[PDB]
Amino acid sequence: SPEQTERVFQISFFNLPTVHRIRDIRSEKIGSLLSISGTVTRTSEVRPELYKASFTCDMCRAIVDNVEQSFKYTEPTFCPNPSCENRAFWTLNVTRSRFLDWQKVRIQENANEIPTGSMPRTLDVILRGDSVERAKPGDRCKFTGVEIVVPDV
Amino acid sequence: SDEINELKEMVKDEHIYDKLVRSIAPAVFGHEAVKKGILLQMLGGVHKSTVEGIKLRGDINICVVGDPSTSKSQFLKYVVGFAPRSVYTSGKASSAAGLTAAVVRDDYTIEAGALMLADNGICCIDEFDKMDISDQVAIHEAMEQQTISIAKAGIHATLNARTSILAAANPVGGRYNRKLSLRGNLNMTAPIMSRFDLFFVILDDCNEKIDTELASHIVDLHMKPPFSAEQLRRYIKYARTFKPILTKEARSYLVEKYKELRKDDAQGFSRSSYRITVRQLESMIRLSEAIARANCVDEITPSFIAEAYDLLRQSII
Amino acid sequence: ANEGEEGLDVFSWTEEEEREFRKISRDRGIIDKIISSMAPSIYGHRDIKTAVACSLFGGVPKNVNGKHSIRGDINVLLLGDPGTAKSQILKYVEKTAHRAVFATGQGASAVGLTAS
Amino acid sequence: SEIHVRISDFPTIYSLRELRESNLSSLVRVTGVVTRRTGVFPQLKYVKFNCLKCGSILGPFFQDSNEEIRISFCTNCKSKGPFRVNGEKTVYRNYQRVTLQEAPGTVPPGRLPRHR
Amino acid sequence: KVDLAKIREVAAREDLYSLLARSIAPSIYELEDVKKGILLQLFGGTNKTFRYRGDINILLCGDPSTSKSQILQYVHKITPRGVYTSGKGSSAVGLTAYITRVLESGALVLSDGGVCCIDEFDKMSDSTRSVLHEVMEQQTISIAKAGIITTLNARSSILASANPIGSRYNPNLPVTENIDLPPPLLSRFDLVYLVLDKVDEKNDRELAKHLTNLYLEDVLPVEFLTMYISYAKEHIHPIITEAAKTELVRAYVGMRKMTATTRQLESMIRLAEAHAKMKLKNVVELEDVQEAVRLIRSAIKDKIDMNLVQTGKSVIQRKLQEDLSREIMNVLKDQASDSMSFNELIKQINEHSQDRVESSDIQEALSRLQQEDKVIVLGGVRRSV
Amino acid sequence: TTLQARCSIIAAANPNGGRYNSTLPLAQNVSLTEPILSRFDILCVVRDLVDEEADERLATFVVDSHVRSHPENLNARQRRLQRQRKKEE
Ligand SMILES: Nc1ncnc2c1ncn2[C@@H]1O[C@H](COP(=O)(O)OP(=O)(O)O)[C@@H](O)[C@H]1O
Ligand SMILES: Nc1ncnc2c1ncn2[C@@H]1O[C@H](COP(=O)(O)OP(=O)(O)O)[C@@H](O)[C@H]1O
Ligand SMILES: [Zn+2]
């Protein structure tokens, strides 16, 4: 077994004192530990995220690895070889880079907390790592984790 | 750790059969034979695959016929809320197609029917008499071959649906008539009647003592059991782990008792077996396997086949 | 469900299999062996097994001078009482034929068959 | 000119629902039904191009049938230029995409299929 | 935009029954049994689990000109939770959960513990009857569409108002066969109220005078009713005593030997539970049991003869089967072939056997004989054996 | 479009009333008409007749098949193939 990578430890914090509704979600508490009860409408394909990325320079074949992609696919700017002056045209290393599972499940609030004459508000929930394919659509279910904000890619 | 010792003290009991036929549906008063049949549906037979590729049904299908106040639907609620992978449905209609897979424009896709959602489980069907003719001809393949084959427009497939059927069908035209035959009171035809494993006729008789005891019992569940539900589930799953095997004397008793069954169904001059078929022979071997699973033994005694023939003799009249 | 056929094409053959075919084809009574071996899990029904063997092997389609066409396949109807294992023969032909399509009841449309 | 090998009977069968990140860059055995099949298309097995400003030609690069070969520069000039296919050495191979939907008897009952 | 002592002071009065009975519908003077049935639906039974539904169900059978949609509007305004909908307006799977755009679900799950008031209840489609069958029985809707399986708790009390076909209907022949609704729905309604009545010029002058008194001139308040139901439904938990079960079982014995089912008994149980919920005593006394027996007795005033089957039709079907067997025997004596045309044989059977009946009854008896396999049908052709 | 569908059609039908009548001809036994019956080359009629000895051998065969097809009856795959061939001989 020659291939040995760093283990991607995932930390799960459950049993919060309170649970939030989708209607109760405000933007003042992003990056905070929240628990949300809801019903999944549809689930997405278990797809690979580019978690840790490695790239090669096309000029001098220098290697830059551990590039982190937050929300868009990014390439390194400065070539680490001081003799080379490359700025663009970086080739991705598919084998060397480390990937993670991704799933985007879309949830809405339950029919018990839906008020009179309202369409249900929706929310996208990201499952990564071990938690992929755990939630099936149409189930009353509680997700505990992080409220995040995503930009227009 | 304690549950395996509890299971060990279950399997060494002297009267396992009576405890298991009394533990099924404790809220429902009476009808111990229907509880025995429902228990045998929860245990069931073993699936067999012949080396010629021919599949043999291991599932058990009960039809319960009775007056409009006989707690057939209470049995249906008990089986749905108790047994895993169980689906309640109405036989008359449902949203889109019920009990059948439907094609949907979105290019067509398959919506699973209530038979498909009860995969390796129990599909409790209410109002089974007024079911649709497409549902009739899909059930005609769905019981035995355990598949529904749909070839519509651009999409063709076969869909495996391993499902044991519990149905509760009211007699058409009112209550059950005791003078008529059991075939006369139901809307089903011959082949779908022969596809059912066993039948249970229950009547709403009008006597003083039975009515007073039933009424006191049903008010005794309003603000007033040999095995618990988890205990029953553990023992039933342990019986599902058993795969019983036959003996030679069991084969001899089964062929002689199939001779006795085949003799007694003669329709006079026509020499026609209107109800007793080979499906009754597969019914007897499935009920013998279920009863051998009930006592948690690996072999079928000829007494088990005798009890199975007693069950078919109760269902035949 | 059988995991014993190891290969990309189950209906393919090797040269030794062709030699065994030529060996067993010259045996007198191979017709009765094929008929008795067709659906082995079903007892009796010699007419059914013979008709299924005839439909499964089939005749020869003919083209006369580029002007006339003769159908070569054989279509077999099984009419019978329930509980006579009519559908298990159909499932055996599904296992046995090189290409096999199934349809039943109201679930087969007019354009689910033919083409749409 | 070239021979190809079809590897048969991989002992691990993975459905489309069970594919994860650990199975990338590896052989997978997938059961599924084909719904959409495109036509036969010729594809350049080796792509080569002519730089217009320089006399040197770009070397032939093998096509991986996933993404086009990214031409950052030329072998004589270190900048992008006009590139078009030379007829000196061209090799064509067949290419066809199929939409492999999961089989409806394989999926959990009532769920959605997966497309790869 | 745009305490509980008031509950306790009317809880101690002994005249709160007629007070709340005239408070719910002050405009309608008659049908006090109808308003007390709707009142006991607002109170309802307790949610029991170990599950049985505690809510009573009311179907109003009456003429459209007789005021019933006013009562539906009033029970909509009184209730804390509840939705008024029209039967002609919503059908198919509209009243239950349907996939749109998300899952936009209907009123049968949005009104948990409340009243769903369906006007023009005769125009339910067959899919909607099948949905409503598990609404009454399972108190839980369940669908499986677009990869979404949902099992949603209905737990709703239904109030329906039905329309007879065309004219008002005579009381001599039973009214239930006029109503287009299937008898599986009628067997699950706890209370049916015949709103049909005839003019007798007694209070119709009073109705016209007080109806014009809103033009000539300009009991508990509705908000007090709303908080009273909201306090009674969750903060009050009645219990069943061992004493009242004896009067319950002898009342059921009296009903059965008069005609009754065990659904009627369990309706008495939940009705007495709802009356104890109204009285805020947290105990089921004697009096609510006899009140529930009286109300269900008045409902059955209007061997159960359900499934839209009267025993006279149930015996004349077999009589026509015997007459068709005799006609087939006469045809077999006349000719060797037993196959005959349906119209000519039906006309001969109608002319020769007995008085004139429907032509559908003879072919229904022949379909019965198809089920018993005595006679074979082709198509038509009817071959006797 | 003139497609080719060289199909061998194997159909399984039922008689009228659920059971075949031996004293009646084939035409009113089936719900099929003359042209759909006319293309079919071999039409196998099966009658479930009660016999004192055919039911015996049929019952013995079916019970022995249920015994034989039960799951509880040099490597693993080689001996599995060997015992499957021994079972099917
Ligand atoms: N013997 C009994 N024991 C317990 N409950 C009963 C019994 N008989 C009737 N019931 C109650 O009465 C109801 C009878 O309804 P049921 O006969 O199932 O209607 P249907 O015949 O239309 O399905 C059930 O819900 C059940 O709770
Ligand atoms: N030799 C046989 N003759 C008749 N039936 C058999 C025989 N062997 C097995 N069977 C039974 O026939 C059943 C399948 O019958 P099927 O073809 O579905 O009936 P139908 O002909 O009404 O469709 C199987 O469950 C099997 O147990
Ligand atoms: Zn560089």
Ligand SMILES: [Zn+2]
């Ligand atoms: Zn260049």
